[PDB]
Amino acid sequence: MEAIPVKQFVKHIGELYSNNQHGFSEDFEEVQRCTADMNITAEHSNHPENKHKNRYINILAYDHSRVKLRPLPGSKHSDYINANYVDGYNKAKAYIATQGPLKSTFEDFWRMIWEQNTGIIVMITNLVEKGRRKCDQYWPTENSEEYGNIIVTLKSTKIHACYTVRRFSIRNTKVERVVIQYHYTQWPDMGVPEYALPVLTFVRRSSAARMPETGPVLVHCSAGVGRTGTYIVIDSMLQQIKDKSTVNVLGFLKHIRTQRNYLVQTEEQYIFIHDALLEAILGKETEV
Numbered sequence: 001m002e003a004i005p006v007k008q009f010v011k012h013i014g015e016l017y018s019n020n021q022h023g024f025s026e027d028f029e030e031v032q033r034c035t036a037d038m039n040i041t042a043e044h045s046n047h048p049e050n051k052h053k054n055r056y057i058n059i060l061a062y063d064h065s066r067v068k069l070r071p072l073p074g075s076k077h078s079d080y081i082n083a084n085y086v087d088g089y090n091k092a093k094a095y096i097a098t099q100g101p102l103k104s105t106f107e108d109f110w111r112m113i114w115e116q117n118t119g120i121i122v123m124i125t126n127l128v129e130k131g132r133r134k135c136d137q138y139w140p141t142e143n144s145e146e147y148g149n150i151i152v153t154l155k156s157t158k159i160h161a162c163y164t165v166r167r168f169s170i171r172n173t174k175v176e177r178v179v180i181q182y183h184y185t186q187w188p189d190m191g192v193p194e195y196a197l198p199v200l201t202f203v204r205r206s207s208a209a210r211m212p213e214t215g216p217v218l219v220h221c222s223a224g225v226g227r228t229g230t231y232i233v234i235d236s237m238l239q240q241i242k243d244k245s246t247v248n249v250l251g252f253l254k255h256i257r258t259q260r261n262y263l264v265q266t267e268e269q270y271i272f273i274h275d276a277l278l279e280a281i282l283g284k285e286t287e288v
Contacts, residue, residue: 003246006281006288013274027250028267034254050080055099059223065259067096069111081108084260086232089239095232096216097260099224100135107148109138114150114172117215121181122206124227130189134222149174162186162198182206192268196276207235229263233273245287
């Protein structure tokens with residue numbers, strides 16, 4: 001895959017903006033089309049027994065990269081959750097991208113967290129936005145809550161200007177673990193954040209929280225495609241910049257689009273990614 005030095009990437013961004021953002025439009029159009037003939041299937045998502053497990057009927061999890069739950073007694077499709085492994089920078093399956101959990105999927109959600117050895121949750125949505133339900137509260141407001149065989153206890157809450165951090169411990173009663181939730185809270189009902197700096201800080205801090213060597217970082221918003229893809233791309237590209245002082249947004253995005261549908265869902269989001277990376281490059285840190 002063809003990466004470009006930071007200095008060239010910065011000039012490339014100026015070019016994508018020019019001529020009424022003509023370059024951004026052709027880029028994203030290319031992204032929108034790039035899997036159209038691959039017949040990537042999602043039969044499980046579409047199976048009538050999993051229907052109520054999906055937040056949106058047209059947002060599916062591709063079969064080849066879906067996260068599978070261990071089967072349950074009783075049960076055939078008890079392995080299904082609307083969630084996919086997604087690659088990160090130099091590390092396959094660095095993330096799980098999933099929808100905002102439904103009440104009917106709370107057990108599954110926490111079971112996946114257990115079975116995957118996930119230690120970090122990144123939540124990029126409020127429970128309700130502009131009066132619309134985006135996600136259900138899958139964690140205890142206080143003290144403990146049991147979700148099937150997993151007992152979740154809220155240990156601490158830290159509220160920051162643009163995000164909140166919650167520390168849980170979770171116990172499997174089939175028979176411990178720390179799970180930390182980074183919840184970005186400052187998000188407009190329409191469009192992308194006006195300023196990238198708050199988002200950059202959230203990405204930096206939530207990303208550093210990833211301890212070796214634990215399971216994939218779970219990233220979700222509402223549908224688990226738009227803001228979720230945006231986060232995955234920014235996080236990955238930042239890591240690539242720190243490592244090699246090179247960037248490749250379009251190539252990386254086309255790649256992860258094979259892993260879950262609609263990752264980075266809108267052209268506005270695609271543009272935001274570049275604005276965010278530009279400000280990261282201008283603001284720091286070494287070898288630019």
